[PDB]
């Protein structure tokens, strides 16, 4: 379920590209969790 | 009357003014009120009409530079800036259509005079954009055409380039944010 033209996540993964912030936060935490 | 004209402004080729930008706003010589006033008005409108047809085609191509052309995601931002400039132009077209609806006796000549500001600013911005893109200056090399074009005397073109340069400054800030 996605919202209306809610610019928050749109810009979060757009101004800083989607995989950019994704690797900064999730994939980095993903690697940390896998190592742990 | 002005219905087909605004349709061509909106991308819908008028039957007379066939707005296929390759052939331009090709005005068929079936002119109602077929005096040189009417024909001249058709040509004056067709100037901005073909300009906007080409502009819309370019914005669709910029819906974009990272390909084999001048590489860079900034072409989509340039399309966004041009569309932001046209947003005043789109609002002008909408207001003109509203006025045409209000005026039974349509003020076609006055409408052309009123929209002449945008029509005149269109050639300069189009020339600047052609310098940026047809030169295929990759990255902000195409940005240089307008950035060092700061000695641009045309206040209308100056404002359009100012919108484009706000977009460029934001894009450069984002690029610097990445590189930092």
């Amino acid at each position: 379920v996605q919202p209306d033209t809610d610019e928050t996540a749109v810009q979060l993964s757009e101004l800083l590209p989607l995989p950019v912030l994704m690797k900064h936060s999730v994939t980095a935490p993903l690697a940390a969790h896998v190592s742990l | 009357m002005i219905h087909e004209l605004l349709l061509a402004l909106s991308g819908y080729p008028g039957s007379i003014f066939t707005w296929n930008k390759r052939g331009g706003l090709q005005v068929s010589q079936d002119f109602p009120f077929l005096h040189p006033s009417e024909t001249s008005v058709l040509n004056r409108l067709c100037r901005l009409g073909t300009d906007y047809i080409r502009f819309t085609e370019f914005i669709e191509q910029y819906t974009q530079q990272g390909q084999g052309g001048l590489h860079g995601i900034y072409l989509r931002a340039f399309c966004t800036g041009l569309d932001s400039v046209l947003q005043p132009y789109r609002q002008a077209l909408l207001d003109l259509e509203q006025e045409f609806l209000a005026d039974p006796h349509l003020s076609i000549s006055h409408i052309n005079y009123s929209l002449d500001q945008f029509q005149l600013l269109f050639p300069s911005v189009m020339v600047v954009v052609e310098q940026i893109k047809s030169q295929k200056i990759h990255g902000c090399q195409i940005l240089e055409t307008v950035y060092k074009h700061s000695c641009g005397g045309l206040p209308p073109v100056r404002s359009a380039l100012e919108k484009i340069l706000a977009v460029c400054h934001g894009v450069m800030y984002k690029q610097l944010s990445a590189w930092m």
Binding site: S13 | D30, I108
Partner: protein, 251 residues
Amino acid sequence: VLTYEASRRRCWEQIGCPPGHREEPYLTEAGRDAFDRFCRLRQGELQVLGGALLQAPQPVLVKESELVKDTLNVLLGVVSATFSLCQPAQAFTVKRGVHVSGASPESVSSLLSEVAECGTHYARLSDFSLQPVLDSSCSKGLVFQAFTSGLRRYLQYYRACVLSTPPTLSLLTIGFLFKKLGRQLRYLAELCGVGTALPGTGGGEPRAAFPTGVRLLSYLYQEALDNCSNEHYPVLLSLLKTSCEPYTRFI
């Protein structure tokens, strides 16, 4: 019986009592009813030169009210009369050449056809937005589920925006109001391809389909990383940030 007024039109060519009647003024300076006859005559002359080759393109006499109503129809992404999801259309298929207020059908229905491309993309896109719910027996995992559930809810929000306006807006004004929305739909549907009656594109490029399974997630993530900060690129970015929560559950 003396309450009458008179015409101020006084002519130096009419040396007597001038009424003032014009000369059938310029259709450029006045139309919307007479320009209708003039443009229809021009279209008819073109048709007579070409052998009456319009049939449907012969003006579908469309009241501006009727056009606005059909626009409100496609505002739900529905298949209006000029937006019918015909067999070889899957989506907006034009009526019999709607004319404009004081024009023939060529430019009128041409702008109508641009708006019809928009509404056809809307119909197909709404079908694509139903991909999570529709693919209940889906062998692709929570990828299609979260993504197209997001599509359905975002289309619900978009429909809230669309229905928030009166159905009597100018066709050009509405198209401009959905131009960014149109770009978002084109970019998303080029990755969707949701034609139903005539399959294929549901908006955007000739979108045969969308990528498969969580490989659709992979292609979508790569695309959202590259195509960012646009009508669908920011919309897809927000959708990916949301599906990160589906990724959190997948973790």
